[PDB]
Design a protein around this ligand. Sequence first.
Ligand code: NA
Ligand code: NA
Ligand code: NA
Lengths: 70, 70, 70, 70, 70, 70, 201, 201, 201
Amino acid sequence: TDELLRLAKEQAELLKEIKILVELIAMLVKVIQKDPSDEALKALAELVRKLKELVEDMERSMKEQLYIIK
Amino acid sequence: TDELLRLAKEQAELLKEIKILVELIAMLVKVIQKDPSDEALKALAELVRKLKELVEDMERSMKEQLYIIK
Amino acid sequence: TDELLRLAKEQAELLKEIKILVELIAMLVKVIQKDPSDEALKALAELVRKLKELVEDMERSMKEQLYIIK
Amino acid sequence: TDELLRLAKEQAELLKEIKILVELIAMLVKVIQKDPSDEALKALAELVRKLKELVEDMERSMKEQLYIIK
Amino acid sequence: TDELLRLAKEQAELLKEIKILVELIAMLVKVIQKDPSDEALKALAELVRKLKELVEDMERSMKEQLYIIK
Amino acid sequence: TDELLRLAKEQAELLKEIKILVELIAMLVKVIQKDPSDEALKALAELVRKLKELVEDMERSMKEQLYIIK
Amino acid sequence: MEELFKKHKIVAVLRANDAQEAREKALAVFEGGVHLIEITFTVPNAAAVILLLSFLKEKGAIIGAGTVTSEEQCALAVLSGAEFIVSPHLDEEISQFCKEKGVFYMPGVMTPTELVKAMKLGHTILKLFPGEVVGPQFVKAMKGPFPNVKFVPTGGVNLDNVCEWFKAGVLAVGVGSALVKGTPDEVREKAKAFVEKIRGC
Amino acid sequence: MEELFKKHKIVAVLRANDAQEAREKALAVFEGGVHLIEITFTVPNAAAVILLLSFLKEKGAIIGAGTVTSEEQCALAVLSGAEFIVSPHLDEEISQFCKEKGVFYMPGVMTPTELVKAMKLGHTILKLFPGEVVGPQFVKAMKGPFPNVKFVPTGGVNLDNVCEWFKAGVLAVGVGSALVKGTPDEVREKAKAFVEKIRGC
Amino acid sequence: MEELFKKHKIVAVLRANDAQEAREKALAVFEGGVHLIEITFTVPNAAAVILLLSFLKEKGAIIGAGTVTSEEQCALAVLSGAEFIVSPHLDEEISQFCKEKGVFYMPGVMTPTELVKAMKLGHTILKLFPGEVVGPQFVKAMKGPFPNVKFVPTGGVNLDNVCEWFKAGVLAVGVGSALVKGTPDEVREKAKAFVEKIRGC
Ligand code: NA
Ligand code: NA
Ligand code: NA
């Protein structure tokens, strides 16, 4: 019953991180649409890689909570 | 508990959607890096807008899930 | 419950008093509308002062009743 | 005992409205004492009519509460 | 378990008084070190007398609380 | 609860220590009044400092005891 | 709301020793072109004054209540018929129990911390009081970080410095002792002077 | 205590780098005619100075503690014998814990919002700090909406501008660096000058 | 942090209408000699600007975020690599939740009550905004009761009045419109002039 709230807090943390990172990716895309550059695209690639890592972490935590509720 | 597992089902569906969309965004960013185009950047903007909506859906479902557990 | 119903009796007595006083005030206002005078206005002022006192008494009794029911 | 508390809340609402209106009537009576006028007496009549309506509403709500508490 | 808790309240009050008075005694001692005087020594003696009284009060309260706790 | 009686025992020990130290401070103050000296004032400062330390210890013990009771 | 202040650009703040002076000067101010009038609750029997000015309300005036520092004074002022409420400070309860009423509430700020607390409660038009302590430079300095906030400065607004306040970018000005002092016919000329001066800044 | 402020009309705010200098200047400013003195809790070992100045208390002086930012400091200053407590800010905890102690507390305000918050806690005499940033225009402006509040301005009160502050309608003034800088005989002459000019205008 | 403000003694607050002008002006300011720069969260896509100026960090620049009025903005600014966070107001929740991350937060105060609240929250370096409303008189007057607090004034700092602010005893000054307006080479010349003046006085 306490692992459940632990995983819920873990998920809330991850989701806040993911939403902030999506905001930053959107801003960087708006900036690139006007002034294109290679450093901006490399930074966008790094941000997308971090987003993939965060999504995998979220997915692991959600599968563990689904197992616990089972 | 049935409400709770239905919320878990909804959340898992949303997470799979988000993971597919992030994969597509990463591929499109690589394609833009190698050959830049403006329609590619417009499509990237569209995909990021979709991603924002999906994150919002996930977050407004997780509030309900937590409130029902609380 | 006898505390509660005694406070209800108190409030009912006060409400009858207040309604009678309001009717007398309305009558005196009509009499002043047709024939104004200074003694009539002093009597109106005294009636309004007594009405304020009655309202305060009712309020105390009602808040004590609400405290007890809580 | 919750249908009792909703009435104990509607009655406090009505009582606060009545206490505000009585203060307004007292102020208007003072103003009329200092400088008598006809429009002031028409407004005072309107205010007393409103006060009568509020007292009737109060008594209706309190009789409903008395019937439930019985 | 209520007498125990009010005894704890009383002891906490006395402890705060003792802490404050010890701070004042330390300050006065340092002031006396820098520039000695006889009125300062009389005041220091009075403060130490007060401190002894407060310690006695603390102990006669703690004996009661130890009597009740068993 | 033996935790609570252990805390009472430790408080009694600290209170006896503080009582002895306050008594020695009173004696030293009288000796300094009668025939002033500077080394006596340095010793008085040291005694007041260790008294402050003991008061802090008593404080941090009574906080835990109040924590456990309430 | 926004548009009444934006159109009339002047609000009269009535201080008075009694209610008959307040009513005569509200009439004289409305007879000079000032259609926004505020009766402060330092005037004795002020809700009565607001109640007995409904004829002006039918002629085109907007009457409101000032110096409100309680939730019962807001109830009394809305009962009497006030269309807007004003405070010389910021209160969270006078604001949360006014949002529900649906009444326009304009609180008063002097620092940007109070400004942010008022913005967090939904307030976009703020009263700047006392305006002569901070000056138009406070309004110009708030433009950068807080570009959506509009100010109605109250305190120390004269004919000489009323154009400076509109150059700084205020929405309207609340004028007090420079309108409503003197005999009720000198006020009728002060109001005309102010109204024409504000249309020549 | 309001009677004492109204009678003596000057409070010497005393900051020093030592306790002996504090005692010297307190005696020197008492010789000039200043019966109200405040020892700031920024002077090293200030409760000791308040405790040792009782010989002046028997002569007719009123000693209090300033720059109090804690409840423990209020306890220590009341133990040491202080008659009043002063703060440069407003604190609700210090106020509600000094109200039960029955001790006089004079918080410090700068804004009408802080002013209304202090009034809601029962404070009628407020300290206006820093007084040289707002000026006597702040007091003239506060007169209108808040007629029952008295101010004791502190900060930048000189011989020149003290009659301005008193025309603005302050209850008393708190004088610091203009009064207590120098040797313990310059301070006596400065206190004499201040008292003479305050009773003059 | 304390050492960087003490060393560089000037922060460039940067407001712009778009992101490209922001990046151009940040580069120009760094060329002029200013190593501390703040991008206000009023510039469109400001976290992107903070992220894309990471090349200057290796040259020796310190980049921070200003006008942060939310916790989400603090998160978004720390993500893109802001060294410090600045706010035109004091917010208790931003402090609570920025102290758990270890990020340097500099809130803005205007009155001693806000100052004591920030001190109770742990803040020893404060932002003084709007600086032109309070003047160096505020900084000199706060030395007495609060010796340990150091101020960074923001608001109407010029080439003329910067030596006044530094005589009053401030760590650094945040310069806005006087510094960052004009074409990006006039901005470099202005930065040179400001650095030379600050090292002169
Ligand atoms: Na209301
Ligand atoms: Na106290
Ligand atoms: Na953060």
